[PDB]
Amino acid sequence: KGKLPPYIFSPIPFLGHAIAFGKSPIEFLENAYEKYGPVFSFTMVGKTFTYLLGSDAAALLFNSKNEDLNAEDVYSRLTTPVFGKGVAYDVPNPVFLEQKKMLKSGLNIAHFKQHVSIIEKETKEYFESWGESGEKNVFEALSELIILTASHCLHGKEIRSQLNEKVAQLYADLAGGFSHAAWLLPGWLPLPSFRRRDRAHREIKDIFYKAIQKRRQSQEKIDDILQTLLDATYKDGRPLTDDEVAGMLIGLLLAGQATSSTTSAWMGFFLARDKTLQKKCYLEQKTVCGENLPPLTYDQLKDLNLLDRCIKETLRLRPPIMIMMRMARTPQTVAGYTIPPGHQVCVSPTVNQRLKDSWVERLDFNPDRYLQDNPASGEKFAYVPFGAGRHRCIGENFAYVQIKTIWSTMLRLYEFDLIDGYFPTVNYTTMIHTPENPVIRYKRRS
Ligand code: HEM
Ligand SMILES: CC(C)=CCC[C@@H](C)[C@H]1CC[C@@]2(C)C3=C(CC[C@]12C)[C@@]1(C)CC[C@H](O)C(C)(C)[C@@H]1CC3
Numbered sequence: 001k002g003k004l005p006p007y008i009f010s011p012i013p014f015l016g017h018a019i020a021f022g023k024s025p026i027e028f029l030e031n032a033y034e035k036y037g038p039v040f041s042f043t044m045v046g047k048t049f050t051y052l053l054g055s056d057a058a059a060l061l062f063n064s065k066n067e068d069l070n071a072e073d074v075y076s077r078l079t080t081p082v083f084g085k086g087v088a089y090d091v092p093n094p095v096f097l098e099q100k101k102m103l104k105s106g107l108n109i110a111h112f113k114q115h116v117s118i119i120e121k122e123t124k125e126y127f128e129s130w131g132e133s134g135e136k137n138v139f140e141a142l143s144e145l146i147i148l149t150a151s152h153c154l155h156g157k158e159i160r161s162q163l164n165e166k167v168a169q170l171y172a173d174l175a176g177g178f179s180h181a182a183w184l185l186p187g188w189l190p191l192p193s194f195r196r197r198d199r200a201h202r203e204i205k206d207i208f209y210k211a212i213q214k215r216r217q218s219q220e221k222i223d224d225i226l227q228t229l230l231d232a233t234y235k236d237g238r239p240l241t242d243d244e245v246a247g248m249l250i251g252l253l254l255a256g257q258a259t260s261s262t263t264s265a266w267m268g269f270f271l272a273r274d275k276t277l278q279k280k281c282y283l284e285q286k287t288v289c290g291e292n293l294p295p296l297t298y299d300q301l302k303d304l305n306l307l308d309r310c311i312k313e314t315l316r317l318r319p320p321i322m323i324m325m326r327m328a329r330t331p332q333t334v335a336g337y338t339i340p341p342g343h344q345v346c347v348s349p350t351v352n353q354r355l356k357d358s359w360v361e362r363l364d365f366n367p368d369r370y371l372q373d374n375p376a377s378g379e380k381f382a383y384v385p386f387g388a389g390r391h392r393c394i395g396e397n398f399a400y401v402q403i404k405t406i407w408s409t410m411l412r413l414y415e416f417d418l419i420d421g422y423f424p425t426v427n428y429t430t431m432i433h434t435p436e437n438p439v440i441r442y443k444r445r446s
Contacts, residue, residue, distance in 0.1 A: 005050055005337045008032060008042035016043025022180035023428065025322065029053065029351045039335045041343070045184040050343045052334060054355055055379040058347040060334040061326060062381050062388040066093040069345055071391050073327035074183075081193055082177045082254065084201060087247035093390075095234070099244075102232050103252055104394050106154060106225050112401045113298045115153040119402055120296045122149045123409035126165075132444045135419060139265040139438035142406070143257070144168040146264065149402055150256025155249065156225045162207050168257075170196040174250075175258045178431045183325075197250070204246040212242070255395055258432060259320045260402050265435050266318040267310060267407060269424050270365045272416040272440060277367065281307050282411050282445065293412055301404050307411075309367035311403050312376070315353075315385035317365060320432045322350040324387060349384050350433075358382050414442040 010016040021028045021044060029051060032040055038057040041050045052058045061069055075089035088096055126145045130136060144165035151167075152160040177193035208215075211226055220227060229245045240248075271278040285293060288303045325346050332339040339345060354362040358375040359382075375382035386393035393399075410416075417440075424435030 001338055003337050005039045005041045005339070006036045008036065008040060010043055014043070014046045016045070018044040018180070018184060025428065026348075026350050026426075029348055030356075033351070033355070037335075039337050047184070048343050050328075050339050050345050052345065052347050053351050054358070055352065055375070055381040057334055058352055058381040058384070060332060060339075061324065061345055061347045062384065064326065064332070064389065066390055068328070068330045068332065069326035070329050071326055072096070073329070074325040074344060077187060078178055078182050079251075081182075081187060082174050082197060083251045084197065084243060084247040086241070086244050088251055098234055099248060100394060102229065103248065103255075105228050107394060107398055109298065111153075112397065115398070115401050116296050116298050116301065116405050118152050119149045119405040120409050122152060123406050124413070127410065127413055130414070130442065133442065135439055135441050137438055138268045138416075138440040139261070139435055140168070142264040142268075143172060143261040145406065146257045146261045146402070147171060147253070149406065150260070151253055153402070154225075154252050154256045154398070158211070158226060159204075159207050159249070162203060167200075167203075170200050171254065171257055174200065174254060175432055176430060179429065180431070183431070200250050201246050204249040205242060207249075208242065208245055256398070256402070259395075260399055262320045262432055262434050263311070263314055263318065263399075264403055264406060265438050266424075267314040267403070268410075268416060268440055269418070269435060269438070270314055270317075271310065271407075271411075272418050273423055274365060275417070277310070277365075278411070278416065281310060281407075282415075285408060285412060296405055296408055298401070301401060301408070304404060304408065306367060307404055307407060308400070309370050311400060311407075312370060313365055313367045316376075316383065317354065317363075318426075318433065318435075319349045319353065319385040321385070321387075322431060322433055323348050324391070347381075347384070349387075352382050352384060355382065412445060414445055417441040417443075 008017060017028065021042075032042075032051065033053050038054045039050065039052060041048055052061055072089040072091075072093065079088050080090045083090070087099060123145060126141070126148065130141075147163060147165065147167045148160065151163050173192050173196035176191060181189060208226065208230060211230065214220070215230060229240060229248060233239050271281065284304060284306045289296070289300050323346050325344055328339050328341050328343040328345050330341060332345065353359070356362060358379060360369065370376060381388060386396045419439055419441050422437065424438050427434040427436050
């Protein structure tokens with residue numbers, strides 16, 4: 001009823017810990033865990049945040065209904081300037097639950113089977129630009145490549161043909177909107193997320209202005225996706241506006257690319273640092289697929305068990321979403337505490353996924369940790385890179401098909417090494433944590 005979580009004293013009124021948290025959020029929450037335990041409260045920018053660390057505490061957020069712990073209250077200020085009005089967190093959840101269902105229509109094994117060859121080809125094609133050896137920014141390459149692979153697979157060849165690698169800079173500017181400043185300040189700032197949204201909306205308006213330029217007397221008779229969004233209605237029978245179609249296409253491409261590009265880069269550096277692990281991943285390709293390395297198949301991906309655990313271990317140590325946030329609209333109880341309405345309630349996949357008391361060798365990249373007892377199978381919410389509950393991801397399978405096919409291809413193409421044994425440190429500029437100085441050394445494989 002009355003037992004508030006312990007509060008972290010700040011000697012600075014109103015601001016609170018906004019600077020220390022924003023600067024080193026993972027170190028901040030781990031230090032707070034040691035001192036205050038799994039549930040604690042602190043001020044940033046005149047607002048109270050309450051963090052739930054470890055499986056048991058995080059369960060409150062993951063088990064919660066949107067009416068009690070509300071996502072759009074927090075996320076709208078972050079996503080609405082990125083996607084546009086009327087989609088995702090700019091509408092009531094029930095409306096968004098209809099948009100989410102629509103974007104799920106192409107996410108099935110039927111489609112993923114087609115996806116494998118598209119991605120393998122785009123990867124083989126893109127990397128011909130890299131030659132026989134060299135030192136290149138693998139994060140800029142994967143950011144470019146995954147605009148092409150995500151759009152081709154999720155959006156289709158029509159939209160894919162209207163996009164190029166330059167769209168990667170637009171999507172890096174959109175992703176720049178996901179920051180501590182956007183999370184906590186009034187939305188009038190010097191940065192360029194705004195310029196990239198208008199440019200991207202324009203492209204998607206001209207792709208379906210072109211499809212809707214035909215949509216007037218045109219009845220297409222070919223298996224499509226893009227018709228899905230143009231041909232859909234809400235449960236009330238109402239069709240999508242051009243603005244709603246546009247915002248959902250921006251959003252699907254962001255979901256397909258922003259999450260996979262950082263994860264794919266990080267996995268590159270984990271594999272370059274562990275040469276023994278990398279040669280085992282390559283040898284696995286030949287063990288599963290054959291010495292001759294013929295075209296990749298969906299049914300092969302499921303048997304790349306070491307590469308699967310390497311992606312799992314990359315999402316453990318460098319998940320692209322480090323925090324998930326809700327507004328408490330109703331009193332909530334956890335670990336014997338009462339959270340009052342108006343608290344912002346957060347969980348951190350990054351903190352849960354390296355918690356000292358659950359994970360052995362917690363900072364080490366060890367894909368074999370999953371072949372014995374581990375908190376990913378042993379606990380409910382210690383490993384939650386794609387979330388859980390009512391706001392959980394719909395693209396986990398697609399993300400695995402995309403990263404596995406790209407890295408299957410890249411490991412067949414090349415051998416990768418660190419430059420001067422430099423391992424990229426974390427960039428906290430945005431809340432999608434990116435590798436600093438992500439220049440990789442490569443040479444032609446075998
Ligand atoms: C490795 C890549 C990905 C990661 C790590 C990831 C992670 C996440 C996380 C953590 C959430 C939960 C957000 C929260 O609870 O506040 C989420 C939600 C979501 N993700 Fe993903 N995601 C990825 C790729 C994708 C892709 C490819 C799509 C679509 C094709 C997608 C669509 C969504 C959707 C629709 C939500 C639901 C938001 C809601 O219901 O409120 N994600 N994702
Ligand atoms: C426009 C439509 C329908 C989009 C569908 C996809 C969205 C729901 C996804 C794509 C990117 C996404 C994973 C994201 C997040 C959640 C769900 C999003 C918005 C959030 C807001 C979760 C909290 C994170 O701390 C952070 C702010 C970095 C991300 C940003 C991307």
